[PDB]
């Protein structure tokens, strides 16, 4: 059973109007434009005992993603594919499950990680990639941060030597079979305005948000609307235009952090 969150921090009409008044002059509380992303930090290899990891700061939102690889027999249905298992934890569920699945879908459906290249022995043994994503600081737009952390952690992942049966964890053999990074861009509808990368206050006053996932060739690769409110046909049309032109900038920035 899913139910309207009773803990939800109701934000007075007076404060919403302040924010909306700024939007009307094309500016936000923290000074950025309506289409601007917050400052982005990525620290790779943050969790030393992870196979690959990334600590992402997007504004005040902090996410730590880490990978862990294991050898498993493949699923009966898919004898020639490895596995990706995404898990999200909110520390400060349901929203956690949604986040996990949305991230998973955009990694899987985009073919960013090629699962068919995770086979060791077809039908006998394949790699399972455990991706665990920990939201440490909730500063708004957790999803985009999760995607950034996830992608970064995957790129940071070391693959080890296979003794044939056994994993030799002090001989690094290679990297994950990654085709390209992927970004998720969230656009929030607040009043009659569209805003990129909504912060905490912005998320609390928004009608709804919509998240678009892009590969570098700017193909759409996942969409998820979110929030208790609705959004018009034109809103969504504009939102993706805005999202896509933002995607280019964010991909560049992501690549810089990853060493391309």
């Amino acid at each position: 059973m899913s139910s309207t969150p009773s803990n939800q921090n109701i934000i007075p009409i007076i404060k919403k109007e302040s924010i909306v008044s700024l939007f009307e002059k094309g500016i936000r509380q923290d000074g950025r434009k309506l289409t601007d992303y917050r400052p982005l930090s990525i620290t790779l290899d943050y969790a030393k005992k992870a196979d690959g990891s990334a600590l992402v700061k997007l504004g005040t939102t902090m996410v730590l993603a880490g990978t862990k690889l294991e050898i498993d027999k493949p699923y009966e249905d898919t004898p020639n594919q490895g596995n990706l298992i995404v898990n999200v934890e909110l520390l400060p569920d349901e929203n956690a499950i949604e986040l996990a699945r949305v991230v998973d879908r955009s990694l899987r459906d985009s073919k960013a990680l090629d699962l068919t290249k995770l086979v060791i022995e077809p039908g006998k043994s394949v790699w399972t990639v455990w991706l665990d994503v920990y939201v440490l600081d909730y500063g708004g737009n957790v999803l985009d941060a999760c995607t950034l952390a996830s992608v970064a952690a995957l790129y940071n992942t070391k693959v080890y030597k296979v003794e044939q049966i056994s994993v030799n964890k002090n001989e690094v053999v290679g990297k994950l079979p990654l085709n390209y990074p992927v970004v998720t861009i969230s656009v929030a509808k607040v009043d009659k305005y569209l805003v990129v990368d909504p912060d905490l206050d912005e998320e609390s006053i928004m009608d709804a948000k919509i998240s678009f996932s892009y590969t570098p060739d700017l193909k759409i690769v996942g969409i998820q609307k979110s929030g208790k409110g609705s959004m018009s046909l034109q809103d969504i049309d504009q939102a993706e235009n805005t999202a896509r032109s933002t995607a280019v900038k964010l991909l560049e920035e992501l690549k810089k952090h990853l060493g391309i």
């Binding site: 059973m1 309207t4 949604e98 985009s110 759409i220 969409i223 609307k225 929030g227 049309d237």
Partner: protein
């Protein structure tokens, strides 16, 4: 191995054209002991929804001072698919429950009923893709059947991409083998999108085309919902948008 999704005559595996809806069947007030109820059928996807009307909420701390709390369950019966589903809720069922609840929250005038809960229970009786939308619409109509005030009814279709071809209202076959699946639900009179998801892959152009197609589909479904509201029972044979 993988089926041809568009045949040489330009038609789909079930004989439909890219712009054709599956058959629709809707009936209301089907459950006696519920405050509102509807059965919705799109082709072979069939859902029943029950509403247990605005009512004081069990543990008060879980209620809200300004609004009703919606409690929504999206669930698939074990015998709704070819292989038996575990009745225990899946991560998919958990996500979809949330997505559906949020869709309803944008429509239902919850402010009218402070300190109450409105329970919406949804059961998929047969699945042939588009279950989340059929469930959502059944819910929308059950709420209407209960006389709970809303901004508008909700109508939805999944639009998608089959063999490079943009298509309306997917099969299980098309869901399973197509390039994209994009469920969209609206309050049509308001042009307000209530649920919007895409899995798979599309170009922005394709996304825009598919979106336009979904609207045409949605408008046909919406007229049927309106009629179902008056007559309590509606049947509609497959046809072009």
């Amino acid at each position: 191995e993988r089926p041809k999704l568009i045949l040489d005559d330009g038609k789909r595996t079930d004989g439909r054209k890219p712009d054709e809806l599956r058959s629709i069947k809707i009936e209301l007030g089907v459950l006696k002991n519920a405050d509102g109820s509807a059965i919705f059928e799109m082709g072979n996807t069939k859902a029943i929804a029950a509403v247990y009307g605005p009512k004081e909420m069990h543990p008060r701390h879980l209620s809200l001072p300004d609004r009703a709390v919606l409690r929504v369950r999206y669930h698939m019966t074990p015998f709704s698919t070819d292989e038996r589903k575990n009745p225990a809720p899946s991560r998919r069922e958990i996500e979809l429950s949330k997505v559906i609840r949020e869709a309803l929250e944008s429509a239902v005038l919850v402010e009218l009923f402070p300190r109450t809960a409105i329970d919406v229970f949804t059961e998929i009786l047969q699945a042939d893709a588009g279950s989340r939308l059929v469930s959502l619409m059944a819910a929308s109509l059950a709420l209407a059947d209960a006389g709970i005030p809303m901004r508008d009814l909700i109508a939805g279709v999944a639009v998608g991409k089959a063999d490079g071809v943009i298509i309306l209202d997917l099969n299980e076959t098309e869901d399973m083998w197509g390039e994209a699946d994009m469920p969209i639900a609206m309050m049509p009179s308001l042009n307000q999108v209530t649920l919007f998801q895409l899995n798979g892959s599309m170009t922005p152009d394709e996304f825009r085309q598919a979106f336009d197609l979904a609207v045409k589909g949605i408008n046909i479904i919406y007229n049927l919902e309106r009629e179902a509201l008056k007559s309590k029972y509606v049947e509609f044979k497959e046809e072009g948008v």
